[PDB]
Amino acid sequence: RLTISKRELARLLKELKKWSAPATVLLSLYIPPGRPLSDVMTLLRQEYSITDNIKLKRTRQAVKRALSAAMDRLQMLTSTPPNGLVLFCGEDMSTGKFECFMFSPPEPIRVFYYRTDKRFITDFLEDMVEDNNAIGIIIVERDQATIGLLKGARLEVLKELEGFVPGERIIEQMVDEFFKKVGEEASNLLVPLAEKGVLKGVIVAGPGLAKQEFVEGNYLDYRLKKILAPELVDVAYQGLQGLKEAVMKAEKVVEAQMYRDAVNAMEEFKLHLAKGTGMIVYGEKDVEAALEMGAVKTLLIHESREDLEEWVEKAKSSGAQVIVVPESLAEAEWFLKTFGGLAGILRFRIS
């Protein structure tokens, strides 16, 4: 009922980090699973008692309010969800809006944690969503480049560049100069991520020789250079087309295996459809049915489903490989409108 996914978490995290308060009046609360909620309740109550010691009225009220709204959202639960609970509550000073967020995280919380601060304390949740497996991608041609980024199954273009290398006003560039330009631009985008430990690798891609010269030269900052994938990937196109081409072909980089799995599953899903094999189960009933039988070899779930976590859970036990179809994937919306965003591929027939 409460459990969110990692995608849903990352989105929320983006809002929560905007919240601020002039004093230590934002409530952050983490309850590990299996804590009698009547014990958390006793603690919030002791906290409430202490509030009258806060001399500044507008501070003391903001804290009483947040504790009450928390004790309210809690009063409604019988026990904690499997991964525990986190609550963020208080009023944002710049906007004026007061909210009490409550949810269960994708992964379980291991300590009880209570804090009032000028901001929500989200560190544990930031650590939970950054997988530290980002791959930088640079596609180089003699006169074109594309810089993109891969995390998980999410592929994106960060920057496209076209130079002035030839095939009043006069403009003209040597290949060497466009490469330096490309390098600097890639560095500004990628070197920051490399420092946060987010970026684990850089793929260099493109058609023919230009990519080899770009690597051999002194264009790319040494920190990017240290995490270069060994194999250059030949691709013909720029932009997202080019990025997809490069990711699919980079078989020796493990951080890309997730995107490949997402793309290949959707392709196997479509194959089955086109060949009229009838080895595809959909609908919650039949999916649940097939799952209970251990029939499902691969489950495909649209990231926007609310019960996403329920099914992710069910699959791991049932014997099914999971594939979360992200909204960025080409087939995403069709898979949501036409199959409700939930379908499995059978390893054996039911009927």
Binding site: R169, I170, Y237, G239, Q241, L273
Partner: protein
Amino acid sequence: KPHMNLVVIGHVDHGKSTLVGHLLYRLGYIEEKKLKELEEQAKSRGKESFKFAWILDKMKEERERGITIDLTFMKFETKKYVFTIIDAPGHRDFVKNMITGASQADAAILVVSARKGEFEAGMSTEGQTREHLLLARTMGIEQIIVAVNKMDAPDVNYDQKRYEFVVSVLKKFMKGLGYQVDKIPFIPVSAWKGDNLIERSPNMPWYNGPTLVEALDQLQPPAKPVDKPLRIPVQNVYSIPGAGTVPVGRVETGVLRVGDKVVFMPPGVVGEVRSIEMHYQQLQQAEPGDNIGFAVRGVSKSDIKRGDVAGHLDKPPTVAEEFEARIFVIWHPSAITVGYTPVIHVHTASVSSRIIEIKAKLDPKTGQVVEQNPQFLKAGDAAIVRFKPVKPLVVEKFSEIPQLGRFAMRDMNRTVGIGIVTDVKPA
């Protein structure tokens, strides 16, 4: 003397550039002293057999690898015609360049090696005799001459049986594409020796047809649509000392004169023609078929790129917010659904475009609806679909300006489908 655009196409290494180069030579368009120097440079780099090809292939990477990478344009003149001849690459990485070439062409020479294995490879599932033939059809090339090449090669040695074998295979395939195969010359040549290029070859007595030059004269010039609004897809943009920034491209429709004010879409930048040049000859007007460079006052090279389209200000080229098309699916490893995003190759442009809906599946031969909103399409299907380009794209309705209204769909470096645009919603 009427002008025509010729694209040279075919599988990698089959002999495209050697043919064009050698043809220009025995037609005396190339200085013997230059051919001498090229040959010496070719031998000294370990590539003797590239002396004619190196007339066309000039880039450092082309010479290093021994392949063509992008288009080269050369003027030569036969008894009846003046041709702009366009040398296109065979390498699979650069079929996007070959396609811009086809989009500018009136006719095609398909160069096909008769050498053992080279032919079969080109005509294989993923071969570029196959692919280039397909793309030439879709970009609207009807007139075709085929040069069955390398007859001189030891594993061929002017054998009529080998020749008739390649002709028949080529015929069965070409007829399935909709070509009028009975009308098209299959000339046995040797791009390297010269056989049947301009004069008749003693080595092949059994051959009675045209030589390649004769075949050229037998072509027919196309309609000149001067009364439709000006459209010039830009193939490249140079920045030239004296001229400034000069877009190059073939005038598809309309007419262009020095002095004209012109707009480039989709950017929306406007300039004014200082000058016009075709094959180093300055012009005052340019009409459909003219392959030209036009200097533009007030426009920066950074404002405009390949695939942009130039028209007059009163009737500017249409920018598609979205567009509708009839498509046939040549090849796909699974299925195509709403949301599918191949790159669209139209005129000189190539822009990814998302299928936002599949209105109807059609019977590929009759055109009747066989299913409203199909769940998907697969290889062999025809359909009416809606397209939203990922970035601003210029297209016209096929019924209005067909040369901006026919397209290929490509994905993972393969040709997936072909199309004609049946409607455009303007930006």
